[PDB]
Amino acid sequence: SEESQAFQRQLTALIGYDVTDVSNVHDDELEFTRRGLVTPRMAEVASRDPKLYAMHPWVTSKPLPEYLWKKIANNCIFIVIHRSTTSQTIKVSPDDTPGAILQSFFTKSEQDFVLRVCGRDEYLVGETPIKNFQWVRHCLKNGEEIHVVLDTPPDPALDEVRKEECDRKFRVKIRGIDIPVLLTVFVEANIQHGQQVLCQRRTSPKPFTEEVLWNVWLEFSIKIKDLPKGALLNLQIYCVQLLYYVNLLLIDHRFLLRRGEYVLHMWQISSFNADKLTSATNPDKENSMSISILLDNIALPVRAEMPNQLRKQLEAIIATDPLNPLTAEDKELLWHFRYESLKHPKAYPKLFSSVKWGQQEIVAKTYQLLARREVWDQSALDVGLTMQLLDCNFSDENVRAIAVQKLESLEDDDVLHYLLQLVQAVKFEPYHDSALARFLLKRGLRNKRIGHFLFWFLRSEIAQSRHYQQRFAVILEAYLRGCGTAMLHDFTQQVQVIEMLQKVTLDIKSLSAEKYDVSSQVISQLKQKLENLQNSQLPESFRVPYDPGLKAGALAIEKCKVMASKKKPLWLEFKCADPTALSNETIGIIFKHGDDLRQDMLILQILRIMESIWETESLDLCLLPYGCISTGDKIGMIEIVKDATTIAKIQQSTGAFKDEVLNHWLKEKSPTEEKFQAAVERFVYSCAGYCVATFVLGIGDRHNDNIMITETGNLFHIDFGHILGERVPFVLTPDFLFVMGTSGKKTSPHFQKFQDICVKAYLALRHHTNLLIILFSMMLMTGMPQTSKEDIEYIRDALTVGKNEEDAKKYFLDQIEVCRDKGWTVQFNWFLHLV
Numbered sequence: 001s002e003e004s005q006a007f008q009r010q011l012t013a014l015i016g017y018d019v020t021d022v023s024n025v026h027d028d029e030l031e032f033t034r035r036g037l038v039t040p041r042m043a044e045v046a047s048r049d050p051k052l053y054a055m056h057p058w059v060t061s062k063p064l065p066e067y068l069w070k071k072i073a074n075n076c077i078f079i080v081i082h083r084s085t086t087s088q089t090i091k092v093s094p095d096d097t098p099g100a101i102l103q104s105f106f107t108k109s110e111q112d113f114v115l116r117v118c119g120r121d122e123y124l125v126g127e128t129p130i131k132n133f134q135w136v137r138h139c140l141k142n143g144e145e146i147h148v149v150l151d152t153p154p155d156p157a158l159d160e161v162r163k164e165e166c167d168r169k170f171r172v173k174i175r176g177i178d179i180p181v182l183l184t185v186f187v188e189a190n191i192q193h194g195q196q197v198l199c200q201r202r203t204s205p206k207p208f209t210e211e212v213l214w215n216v217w218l219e220f221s222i223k224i225k226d227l228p229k230g231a232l233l234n235l236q237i238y239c240v241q242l243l244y245y246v247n248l249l250l251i252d253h254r255f256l257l258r259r260g261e262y263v264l265h266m267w268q269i270s271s272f273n274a275d276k277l278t279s280a281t282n283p284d285k286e287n288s289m290s291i292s293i294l295l296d297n298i299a300l301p302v303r304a305e306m307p308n309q310l311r312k313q314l315e316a317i318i319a320t321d322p323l324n325p326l327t328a329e330d331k332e333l334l335w336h337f338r339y340e341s342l343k344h345p346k347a348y349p350k351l352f353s354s355v356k357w358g359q360q361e362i363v364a365k366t367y368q369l370l371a372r373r374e375v376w377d378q379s380a381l382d383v384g385l386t387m388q389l390l391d392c393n394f395s396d397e398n399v400r401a402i403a404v405q406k407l408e409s410l411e412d413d414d415v416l417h418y419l420l421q422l423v424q425a426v427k428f429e430p431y432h433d434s435a436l437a438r439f440l441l442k443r444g445l446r447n448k449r450i451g452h453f454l455f456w457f458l459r460s461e462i463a464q465s466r467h468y469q470q471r472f473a474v475i476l477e478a479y480l481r482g483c484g485t486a487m488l489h490d491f492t493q494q495v496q497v498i499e500m501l502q503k504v505t506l507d508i509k510s511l512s513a514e515k516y517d518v519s520s521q522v523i524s525q526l527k528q529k530l531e532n533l534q535n536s537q538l539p540e541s542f543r544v545p546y547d548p549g550l551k552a553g554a555l556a557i558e559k560c561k562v563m564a565s566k567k568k569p570l571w572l573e574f575k576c577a578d579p580t581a582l583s584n585e586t587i588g589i590i591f592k593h594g595d596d597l598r599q600d601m602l603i604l605q606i607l608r609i610m611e612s613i614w615e616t617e618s619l620d621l622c623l624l625p626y627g628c629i630s631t632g633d634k635i636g637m638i639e640i641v642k643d644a645t646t647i648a649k650i651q652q653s654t655g656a657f658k659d660e661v662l663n664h665w666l667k668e669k670s671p672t673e674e675k676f677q678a679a680v681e682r683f684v685y686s687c688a689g690y691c692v693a694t695f696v697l698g699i700g701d702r703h704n705d706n707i708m709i710t711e712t713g714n715l716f717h718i719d720f721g722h723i724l725g726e727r728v729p730f731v732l733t734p735d736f737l738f739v740m741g742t743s744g745k746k747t748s749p750h751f752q753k754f755q756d757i758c759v760k761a762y763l764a765l766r767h768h769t770n771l772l773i774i775l776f777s778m779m780l781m782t783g784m785p786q787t788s789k790e791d792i793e794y795i796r797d798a799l800t801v802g803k804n805e806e807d808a809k810k811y812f813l814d815q816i817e818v819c820r821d822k823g824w825t826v827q828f829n830w831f832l833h834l835v
């Protein structure tokens with residue numbers, strides 16, 4: 001069909017990679033996967049409700065927190081409903097549905113009308129009490145009135161989906177290696193299963209020539225039958241240093257033992273990270289190192305009661321943290337008493353890490369154990385635990401599948417919380433098709449909000465990671481074929497605008513080097529390029545990728561500008577295309593090159609999780625995880641927080657610092673004394689929040705230039721990629737303390753409170769130690785370009801694993817005192833080392 005080839009062309013532009021391309025593939029797993037993902041696509045497409053899908057209501061089954069109960073008048077909530085002009089405030093109890101409140105309204109075609117939010121693509125619809133809608137909870141947190149506009153439901157017609165159309169020892173021959181351009185070298189051959197080396201053979205050393213030929217059989221001690229599925233033949237070249245690596249799945253996607261002539265182009269090194277695991281080969285055929293190999297070698301098809309001191313010992317092991325490495329003794333015990341270990345869900349990661357995966361007999365027994373998982377099946381979903389099983393330590397389908405099963409019960413609100421980290425977790429899958437990928441796919445097709453971010457998270461990786469672009473593309477394509485016509489058009493708009501505004505960000509950066517500030521003619525160039533794009537190619541309105549509720553429209557070219565930090569990022573402002581919008585405040589977007597934003601995304605997604613945790617223990621520390629989306633290599637977009645400045649500028653209104661300046665800025669920006677005291681309170685929460693959060697994540701030691709505050713006193717850290725690219729545990733400088741009214745070594749009402757909020761928040765995180773450890777662990781492995789055990793075991797020390805709550809109270813309070821004793825020392829030292 002000529003239609004499908006235009007559609008397939010249409011798809012490739014949205015993805016930024018061609019899945020039909022067969023240049024860098026030596027098997028058809030990628031094609032097999034595309035075929036495979038039709039069934040679950042079409043199933044989910046078929047079973048999804050037209051109406052609710054179109055309106056995509058954002059709701060939660062969670063309780064309303066205490067702090068939001070206290071913000072309510074008298075079991076009564078004021079909703080303001082709008083026509084084309086006039087409006088009426090309605091009194092409503094939190095437990096009313098959108099239908100019930102609609103019935104109550106018309107008293108003052110009833111089922112032909114829906115309560116849309118004013119200024120947003122956000123509907124308050126469906127059998128959910130008004131309190132359970134996220135937009136309502138946002139309004140209640142902020143203390144803003146809840147404004148809606150009655151109008152027609154969106155047409156499901158628009159979400160139309162296009163109809164689609166041997167006991168033999170294993171051995172490998174190393175032929176040799178080959179590269180055009182450039183010591184002693186050898187080829188190391190590893191058989192791995194969940195970064196666990198089963199056997200290793202090293203080829204004899206030879207001179208480091210462009211073409212090194214061996215023609216040698218590396219014979220292993222593992223039988224062919226004993227190879228487990230998802231076993232990777234890891235080939236690495238050495239010289240005391242590792243230079244190149246490549247992987248080959250010894251067992252393929254059809255359960256067949258891999259055989260035949262292979263020539264694999266290798267990835268160069270820039271110990272462990274996600275990129276090391278990829279079955280993909282280097283696409284750059286001209287520069288890269290190749291290796292030639294040959295494979296010829298066949299499908300893969302009443303208990304006595306525990307002692308006290310053993311159950312003790314077992315329960316000890318299971319209780320410990322995920323980074324706690326298991327002794328051989330621990331694993332033998334876990335395995336021997338596996339049927340008892342199966343009764344404890346929190347043993348599972350450890351228990352499956354105790355399996356000999358190089359023994360068909362043991363693997364088979366392992367599988368008999370998973371058949372009797374009534375305990376797991378009935379266990380309350382533990383997300384942290386479920387993540388552990390999807391990390392790099394487990395490369396077994398069945399094991400990994402029980403984790404994915406447990407995720408099925410996640411509400412859409414919770415999926416979003418974890419979606420980024422769950423996309424990154426695909427890097428740990430051994431095969432392109434996997435229960436995880438299908439889960440992602442299914443949940444995105446079910447809910448347009450999840451679908452939207454999924455698009456951007458996959459695309460983020462497709463556009464830079466050569467190690468994983470092929471896999472993510474196939475998954476993305478799969479989603480795009482099911483999301484519907486209204487979304488397709490949305491994404492096309494979005495991607496065009498993004499690519500447009502990237503060119504400008506890059507082109508403007510070419511015009512002025514890091515060496516000097518903004519030029520007049522460069523500003524003149526800027527405002528012409530925008531004039532040009534607005535008039536020529538900018539669409540009338542596009543959806544904001546970091547906040548898909550909001551639709552941005554026409555540029556405020558007057559209000560646009562460019563900074564001078566040598567990064568030279570843009571600062572764009574747009575009118576909101578929605579005329580029903582309550583305010584005329586712009587939509588502020590910052591476009592920047594030269595900064596890796598994948599890091600920022602992950603840190604922020606963790607912040608959002610830390611807030612969700614705190615909500616469960618009746619706490620809100622006014623964190624501000626702004627919108628941020630990596631769009632390509634070193635390029636992304638950032639949400640501009642309105643009425644916000646940096647702590648640095650406040651101080652400069654060389655390297656001299658005054659403690660009071662911060663306090664005076666708040667007095668200046670608050671009209672009323674009450675609003676000053678409200679903002680001083682917001683500062684104490686937000687400071688404590690960011691103090692705790694950054695301490696746990698090992699990123700507290702920032703420069704003032706990297707910290708900001710809103711005019712309403714909401715402090716919030718920024719530029720997290722910068723840190724991950726004489727010390728203090730976190731920024732709690734003398735100015736921050738002067739707001740609280742304490743100076744030197746003293747104490748006051750707000751400082752005594754600050755400390756109450758810190759510890760409470762800190763100990764709340766410790767209640768989810770295991771979750772944060774795994775998210776943090778995973779962040780390092782999938783977020784950073786280059787990671788080690790020493791790094792990962794920081795969070796262990798920062799969360800003070802295996803301790804009482806009072807030693808932890810002590811620890812953190814000591815950390816406060818360290819900040820005070822140092823004062824300005826560290827802030828000062830940046831200027832000193834700069835200059």
Ligand SMILES: C[C@H](NC(=O)c1c(N)nn2cccnc12)c1cc2cccc(C#Cc3cnn(C)c3)c2c(=O)n1-c1ccccc1
Binds near residue numbers: 642
């Ligand atoms: C660092 C600061 N960041 C934010 O404002 C901010 C926000 N609002 N949301 N957000 C979310 C994540 C990260 N950052 C943020 C910031 C960014 C920026 C980005 C692009 C261009 C310019 C500019 C400019 C300009 C124009 N003419 N002249 C003389 C300077 C700027 C800029 O001036 N500032 C800045 C503001 C106040 C004091 C010091 C610097």
